[PDB]
């Protein structure tokens, strides 16, 4: 399987020093780095065939259009959507989720209805619902969490009722590392006459996504977390639902006929793509998909499980470190050192060239659920090694000793 040496060789950003130490990048959950395959995809686009897409009759226009639509097809296959009509390019998971809230939620919520979310949700998958319920007179409800930060199926069945129209849930928590039971949740949503909206920004880079097997109604993901360019992402939605949603934005490219006062929309998926699209980013997202598929997502998953187990074990041998979340997890650990603020922790680590995140990780309610003000988080991806976990743990030990002499 994965030869970590050969994998790392393809990411130029990894081969540099920070404060006279080799960079130890453990912040992939905030954003991922890019292989040469992707950056060269951007280069070749701008060097050889940049042009507008679709409305066009010249040679470079054809190449640019074939690239953009070919990337759509790669995304469809990547997440196993039935049809290209169901894949929409957006600016990111945030925009994607907002599109569902603006076009779907505001047309299918009346008073008495419920949107059901989770305590562990990223802000992206909280605030749109907050705004949507307030616009429609509906109600926001939270599925409780178990001790270990996982969700039980019973608590979903208890929280979801016949009044629920929407359940929104992250596939993988970016703080707790939990893999939520999305398939089973989709079934409970369907049994109560609701749709399910899946925030997959944290699952899609690290595990295989099959939207048909998941039977999720909407699925959102961000290119920048999966070795892709910044500024692009995907909204998947079942075709039948997209057919009856109005566009979230209006302008060129998404229209068919424009009169002075009224207009008709293009067919799916172009219905939802107003204006000159994210041409190079979408092509580069397609190149990131090719790269990840050649390695294999099951292989990426196995690598991260091995790093997560190794990290956990080494962290239990460290006294005075609390890790949050369950045993079985994705490739991240959020933690605190007792009596050392996480800003101090991150400063010491960055002085040893180690990059982690400190703060609330865009999950403030989760922080309050954990009874913590802030946390530190190391996250792993296909280019991280056991050696880097050793550096992290040794730096945490130095941090401990440094503040308590």
């Amino acid at each position: 399987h994965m030869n970590i040496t050969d994998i790392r060789e393809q990411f130029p950003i990894l081969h540099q020093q920070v404060n006279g130490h080799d960079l130890v990048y453990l912040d992939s959950a905030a954003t991922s780095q890019k292989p040469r395959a992707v950056i060269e995809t951007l280069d070749k686009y701008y060097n050889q065939y940049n042009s507008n897409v679709h409305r066009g009759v010249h040679t470079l226009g054809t190449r640019a259009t074939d690239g953009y639509e070919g990337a759509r097809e790669k995304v469809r296959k990547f997440i196993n959507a039935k049809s290209m009509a169901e894949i929409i390019f957006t600016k990111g998971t945030t925009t994607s989720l907002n599109m569902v809230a603006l076009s779907y939620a505001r047309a299918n919520l009346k008073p008495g209805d419920e949107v059901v979310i989770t305590y562990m949700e990223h802000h992206a998958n909280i605030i749109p619902w907050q705004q949507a319920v307030k616009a429609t007179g509906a109600t926001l409800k939270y599925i409780p969490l178990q001790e270990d930060g996982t969700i039980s199926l019973e608590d979903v069945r208890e929280t979801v009722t016949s009044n629920t129209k929407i359940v929104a849930v992250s596939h993988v928590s970016n703080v707790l590392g939990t893999v939520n039971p999305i398939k089973e949740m989709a079934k409970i949503a369907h049994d109560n006459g609701a749709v399910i909206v899946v925030d997959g920004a944290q699952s899609t880079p690290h595990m295989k996504i099959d939207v048909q097997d998941l039977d999720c109604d909407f699925f959102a993901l961000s290119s920048h977390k999966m070795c892709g360019p910044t500024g692009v992402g995907v909204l998947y939605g079942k075709k039948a639902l997209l057919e009856n949603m109005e566009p979230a934005e209006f302008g060129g490219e998404m229209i068919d006929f424009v009169g002075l006062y009224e207009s008709t929309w293009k067919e799916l998926p172009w219905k939802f793509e107003a204006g000159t699209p994210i041409i190079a980013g979408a092509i580069g997202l397609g190149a990131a998909i090719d790269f990840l598929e050649e390695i294999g997502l099951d292989e990426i998953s196995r690598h991260e499980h091995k790093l997560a187990a190794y990290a956990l074990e080494r962290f239990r041998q460290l006294d005075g470190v609390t890790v949050y979340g369950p045993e079985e997890r994705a490739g991240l650990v959020t933690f605190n050192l007792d009596d050392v603020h996480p800003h101090d922790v991150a400063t010491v680590l960055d002085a040893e060239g180690i990059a982690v995140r400190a703060g609330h990780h865009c999950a403030q309610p989760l922080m309050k659920w954990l009874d913590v003000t802030a946390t530190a988080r190391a996250s792993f991806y296909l280019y991280n090694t056991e050696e880097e976990i050793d550096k992290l743990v040794e730096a945490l030990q130095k941090t401990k000793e440094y503040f308590t002499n």
Binding site: H54, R55, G56, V57, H58, T59, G61, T62, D66, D256, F257, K266, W270
Partner: protein, 137 residues
């Protein structure tokens, strides 16, 4: 030149179109070419499963209008979802692939040429796209 893949017969259908006009008591589709500027209003009056008359009006390039003309004439009297089979054959023809050749497919085929000039595929496919939406339930 290479541009003589604007065939003899194509130029004839552009010069002197076949079924130009409007049909009443009808299935009515209106379509624009995504590569903007070609408009069709395609009208089919059908006798059950068959198109007894098919007509169109539009404004557009030689290819789009000629393909509409050749289409409406090759689709006058057409039988079952064989019409859809013709469409799928046409789309394969544009992509360079070989097809199930000679289930009549009256005339056209000179549009074979736009397997080059891929920027014009949509110009030739407009009329056919209209048909496929015509029979969409």
């Amino acid at each position: 030149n290479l541009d003589t893949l604007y065939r003899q017969v194509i130029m004839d259908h552009y010069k002197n179109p076949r079924n130009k006009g409007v049909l009443n008591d009808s299935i009515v589709v209106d379509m624009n070419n995504p590569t903007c500027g070609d408009r069709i209003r395609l009208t089919m009056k059908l006798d059950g499963d068959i198109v007894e008359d098919a007509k169109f009006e539009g404004e557009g390039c030689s290819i789009s209008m000629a393909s509409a003309s050749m289409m409406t004439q090759a689709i006058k009297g057409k039988d079952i979802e064989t019409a859809l089979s013709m469409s799928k054959i046409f789309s394969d023809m544009m992509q360079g692939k070989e097809y199930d050749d000679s289930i009549d497919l009256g005339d056209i085929e000179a549009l074979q040429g736009v397997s080059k000039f891929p920027a014009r595929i949509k110009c030739a496919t407009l009329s056919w796209k209209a048909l496929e939406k015509g029979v969409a339930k």
